[PDB]
Structure formats: structure tokens, C-alpha cells
């Protein structure tokens, strides 16, 4: 049984469009992504390209900013899937991301259907980055650790919130942490599911298109919900 009407929009393969306009330490960049999401299997695959030349930041720092609707919620947890319940009208996803001993991103995204396409349209601003740090200096490995993100209800805002740390492998040993502070709120007025506390388990793969000459990232994400 479908617990929310929005759940029905994800039974098949859903086309995805991602658009990001960024500005980090004054360096402007634009990223466009296309792919598809398969919530039955908790999976999404996208190819992202820079339309503005070589990116001023590493692709791994953009992974979390560049689609929680595609997580697989097990049958006993369908009542906790806020993300699909907010569809098709969608939700706003806002974050602050603080990089350990470095600058920070502020992001605001709208995730919603435009026609039959799930669109993620993002503005990102980055401030206070070190010229020779791991971000502006491109010192992060091209991979992504698995992370469990604790999701809680934000009842006053009729949405969800999360705070979590990602760990980014630094070239030649060590890890750099990124503290994420996240709030999601529905765009429409229709009723949404507010979840009990639970976790989303993420696993990600970063790859390249051998025929793409522009700066780019191919991303696979596999995400499942688990109760406590």
C-alpha cells in the first residue's frame, strides 16, 4: 500500500535534471547534470558537466549538494518518507557545509517535478576558503566514503532536518571533515509525512566519461533507509 500519493511517482525510472550555479571565493561556475533515478532499487546515476571550464573546487565537495527522493524506504518504513510525500510540488533543501579548517558553502536547492522530470535547481555560495587548502588546491581524492545520515522531523516547519559529517580522503593520507547542517521544507501546502528518527545509508561511486573533454563527474548513489 502506498502511504503517500507522491510515492507513486517513483515506481519506475524517473529522468533527472540538475542545475547548479556556484560562486566560491568569487570564482563563478555552473554545473549541469542529467541522468535517471530508480527508487525501487534506491539508486540514481547522473553525469555532471561544468559549463564554465575547470571547476575551482573538487568534485567530491559537490556530491552532497548535487536527491533524497530516490532512497529506498523498506515497506515497514514507508510512513517515514517525507521526500516522496512532498512530490510533485517538491521541497526546498538548504544547507550550510563547513569544511574543517577551511571555508564553508551555503546552498539552497528546489527539488520538484517539472513535467515528468525530477529537477534539482541549486544556488551555492562559498566563502573564506584558503588559497592553498585542500579545496581550492584540489587535494582531495576522487572517491566518496559511505555515510549514514540521521534524519529527524522539523515539526514547526512541516519538514525534516539533519546534521552529519562527511569524511573526504585527502591525497597522500588523512581525511578532511565537512559538517553539514540541513533543513528541508515543502514547497506546497498539501499534507506531508513527517518521519520518526531514522537513518539514510549512502554509498557513492565517482567515475569519468572517457569521451568527455569538459571537467565532469559521473555519479552513482545507492541510498536505503533504516530504522533505529
Residue numbers in the entry: -1 to 64, 68 to 229
Q: Anything the authors wrote about it?
A:
We report the rational engineering of a remarkably stable yellow fluorescent protein (YFP), ‘hyperfolder YFP’ (hfYFP), that withstands chaotropic conditions that denature most biological structures within seconds, including superfolder green fluorescent protein (GFP). hfYFP contains no cysteines, is chloride insensitive and tolerates aldehyde and osmium tetroxide fixation better than common fluorescent proteins, enabling its use in expansion and electron microscopies. We solved the crystal structures of hfYFP (to 1.7-Å resolution), a monomeric variant, monomeric hyperfolder YFP (mhYFP) (1.6 Å), and a cysteine-free mGL variant called FOLD6 (1.2 Å), shedding light on structure–function relationships underpinning their brightness and stability. Each FP crystallized as a monomer with no asymmetric unit.
Using structure-guided engineering, we conferred the NaOH resistance that we first identified in FOLD6 into hfYFP and enhanced hfYFP’s monomericity in one step, producing mhYFP whose spectral properties are identical to hfYFP’s. hfYFP and FOLD6 have potential to serve similar functions as sfGFP, such as multiple epitope tag insertion, extremophile research, bimolecular fluorescence complementation, sensor stabilization, circular permutation and random mutagenesis.
